[PDB]
Amino acid sequence: GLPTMNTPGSTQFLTSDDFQSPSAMPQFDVTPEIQIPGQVRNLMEIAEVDSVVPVNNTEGHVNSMEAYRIPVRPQTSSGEQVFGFQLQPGHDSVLKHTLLGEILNYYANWSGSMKLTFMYCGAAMATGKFLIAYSPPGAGVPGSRRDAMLGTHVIWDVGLQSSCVLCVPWISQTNYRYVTSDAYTDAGYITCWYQTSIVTPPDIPTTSTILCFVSACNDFSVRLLRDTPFITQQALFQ
Amino acid sequence: RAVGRVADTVASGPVNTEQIPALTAVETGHTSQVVPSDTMQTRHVINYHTRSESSIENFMGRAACVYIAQYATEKVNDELDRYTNWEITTRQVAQLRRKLEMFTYMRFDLEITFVITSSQRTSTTYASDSPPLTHQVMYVPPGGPIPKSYEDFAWQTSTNPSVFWTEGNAPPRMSIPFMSVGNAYCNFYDGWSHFSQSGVYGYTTLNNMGHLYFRHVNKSTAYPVNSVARVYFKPKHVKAWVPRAPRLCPYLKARNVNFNVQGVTESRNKITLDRS
Amino acid sequence: DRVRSITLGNSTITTQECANVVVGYGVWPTYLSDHEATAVDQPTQPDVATCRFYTLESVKWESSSAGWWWKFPEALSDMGLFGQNMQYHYLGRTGYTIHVQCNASKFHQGCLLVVCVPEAEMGAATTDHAFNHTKLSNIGQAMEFSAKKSTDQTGPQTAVHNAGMGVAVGNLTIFPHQWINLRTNNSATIVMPYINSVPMDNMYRHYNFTLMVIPFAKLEHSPQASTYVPITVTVAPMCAEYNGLRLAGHQ
Amino acid sequence: IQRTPKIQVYSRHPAENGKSNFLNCYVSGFHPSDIEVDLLKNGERIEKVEHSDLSFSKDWSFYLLYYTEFTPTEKDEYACRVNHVTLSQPKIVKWDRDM
Amino acid sequence: LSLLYHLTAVSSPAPGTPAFWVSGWLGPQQYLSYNSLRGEAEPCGAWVWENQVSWYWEKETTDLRIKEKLFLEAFKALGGKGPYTLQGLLGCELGPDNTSVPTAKFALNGEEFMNFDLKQGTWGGDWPEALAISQRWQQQDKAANKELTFLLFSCPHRLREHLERGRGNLEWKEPPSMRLKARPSSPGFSVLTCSAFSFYPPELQLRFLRNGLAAGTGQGDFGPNSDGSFHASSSLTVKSGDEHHYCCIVQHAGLAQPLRVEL
Amino acid sequence: GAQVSTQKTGAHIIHYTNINYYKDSASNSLNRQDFTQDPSKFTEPVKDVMIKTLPAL
């Protein structure tokens, strides 16, 4: 017949190939699809949805709802630190189990800008200002509010519009960063500081709550599929 | 511009306006669309990245193992009989289940590939000349007559699709179309089976894909071998709806969603960062 | 603007501190089209006898409350002609309009999360044991979560930080949701379309979606303020239609 | 879903006096979880009574044989006393020597 | 002749009692007992009167530890508050000469609700409690194949292992002791009894006659004994006169004539 | 059929030929080149449209 020649790579099973194969049940009449609402055509559509960040995960708070409640209270001296974490959105313990981190942990490269939304859940009569800052990774962690005002930051004033968005910009020497973070592609630090204080009229409780929210901006991107280091099994589930 | 490519960043300047892009209300259930060119001064950057690796086709389109079926050439126990079976489900491995549990209703064709390996069982001697083994994998639809044992009437596969494979060649592979009676595979089902709200609870009531029976075509060997047939599934032509939140606690069973409670995340010492 | 008035049937829900009206996945509830239906008989469509605002019982929000859940359509199984049409019919199809409401003050603080989870298949309290149906949902009783784990023999796992589904409770925002912040908001209104794999479904064997109300920031106030703040749920079916008429159910 | 038992009292051997005989008491047709059968000698509880293997008939109703090593004479009258979830009082059945 | 197993498991057992117990019946008399409180199966000293050296009785013990776990993993996917007594009938009967016919019935709360099919499915019933147990039982992934090779392959081979081993129990021909006695009653009538004691075969048809003509069977009762023997009874309210003519023409399987007994 | 289509390359001879051989649509290869998307169902599920630069309330 036709004179062929089997190239290297024949009779192999590469698990991520793209080939045709004979159907087992020929001329099967499938059921018609209908208009089910809420179709997903890309996993990045999921990663653009906010999910509340467990910033208060100091043990043992991961076994309650207190992992999400970031406490704020009236201070004596200003310029204190509210919270802070490194920006490792698939490896840091604060971010890697939010909705962004579970999508990122299926991949190995990530790129783009990120949003951080802070909804103040105190009383309607309390008033405060906060400084929410991002620091690129050159110099280390900012140890004071004076070191934090030199970075990318935004000064949030609470009021009727009860949430301010810090948009973490993409500053990197590489086009992508590794998800499981290493020393070469560090991404920096997110800190938040008391701009003035929390000032309240009498007969209001002291401690309040700020909820964080992480998502992805419209230029986010992932690459290089893998498995997650989250789910394990020893045997087949009977 | 092409489709799939992410958006650029327009050049911004200093502003002092009534407009407040940074302030919003989360209470309305609405994600803010604050691009970085709203809260700082940016340069025009022509972004060339695409989102090809993140679509539902490429996210699912890699073949994953779903079952490990074992069957010998000589009965030793009911478990290591001449034949074995498997109820077709994707809920027995932990890798593919967590991917398919990200969406509520999915609709896809399938591509089933078998990696079959035999190993000679431990005895007091092993010197035997054997011809190459031939395996049979018969797919039984819901309602079909099942084989009772070896040499059954029902291995004649008068209408059931079957495959025959001699060891040493390429692995077998056949494609399965969309098989459900509804309009999408229900990955979840918050409901009961009977109308009195009792019986079995959960997703097992709908997904009846059928069985899958394995055996050796060869009648016997001189010394018994133990074959193992790993089954690989690859979803192709995938549509998905209603994205669920990804599972956190590891699984316990194949018919349930039961779990032990776990932390929301890992712990750390304090809420602040304390270096210079 | 902040005010919004909703009129359905012979009832009318008004509010003066509203956030907005989140609507499902952008899809308004409609009737079933001719190129999608399967059952061949003429469906019944009572437009105002069943598409109106039914008000469930009120729950008490405390500073130690973990959360509540209702399961639909089973939560409206006796509210009027929506209950009677569920019994005399084999199939049903509807969308909803869930309006949760909770006013406190300008001196209270707290935050609720109102989610409609489609097919919130719940795990079991103790494993290796299936549970009763009356511990999943009674007819109108607000089934509630718990702070710690639950060791019930015949119930669901009601640890609120795992939300009954073995999932992180912070990630419940991809389902259609709103927040009731006592600082700003007062009510939360969600419109949910019919979400199922089959175009119509039986309304007794299958809970279509679960409404959850989870307090994230806990309720705090002075001891001299109003100690009792209630939460009230007001559900209204939308574009309901039924098929397969037979005797009264539901066995 | 509830059954009431049936007591049938009889002897193994014919009641020939002097030698020890066996009073086989038959309880049948009952569905509790637990039943209490007791053998009696004119109001005296016999201490040592042997139990048979508790089983069920073809219609999913249990049956159980209790028996003692009794000496039949004219004055030795016997009875069976059974306890159920259905019957409040324990049912008296008097043993007749003619069967 | 047929081998049969009588499985029963209760949810909340009475203390001091087993929660699961087996009674094996080679036809009409019992040969096998098992429970949970001792954890092994023993004979009654009735059928074999031998001790098999770890080749026959050691596999019956290991077989019923499997059946104990299947009968205790049942409540466990019953979500009711009430107690449950799960019953089970297992075994096979012999065909014409070969090809034994099996049987497998189960009963929850004294009512038959499921029965392991033969083709598909392995277990099934229209009751809501039947699908819950059937989905629970096949979760262990091999118990359904355990009973498929049980009813068609092992216990009929065990039956042909028993078809020629113990034939002295298949010839138990004990002719009974029959003692016509009588009691008095209400004025005008009398109460008659004819009874039979300690007989092995299960067939006996005892009736009452006036002179030479049949007058009725009476109320026939039945009960076995502590030694593989049975018992019958028959009573009738008869006339206070003519007691010297009521005859009891009754055959037996250990007898070749329907012997007459006297008052 | 000869559905010649473009290849997946980088940015700053590139065609490929594909022939279907079987009589079922479920025997084909994957549809790896469909990157159409809209996240507005999940990020903006709101009735009244919310302008970005305006107050939300």
Author numbering:
A (entry chain C): 1 to 238
B (entry chain A): 9 to 284
C (entry chain B): 11 to 261
D (entry chain F): 1 to 99
E (entry chain E): 5 to 267
F (entry chain D): 2 to 13, 24 to 68
Publication text:
The genus Enterovirus within the Picornaviridae, a family of non-enveloped viruses with a positive single-stranded RNA genome, is comprised of more than 100 serotypes. Human enteroviruses (EV) are presently classified into four groups, Enterovirus A-D (EV-A, B, C, and D), among which EV-B, the largest group, consists of over 60 serotypes, including all 6 serotypes of coxsackievirus B (CVB1-6), coxsackievirus A9 (CVA9), over 30 serotypes of echoviruses and more than 20 newly identified enteroviruses. The capsid proteins (VP1, VP2, and VP3) adopt the classical eight-stranded anti-parallel β-barrel configuration with the N-termini residing inside and the C-termini exposed on the surface. Most of the uncoating receptors bind to the “canyon” sites of the viral particle, dislodging the “pocket factor” in VP1 and subsequently triggering conformational changes of the intact particle to release the genome, albeit that SCARB2 binds EV71 outside the canyon.
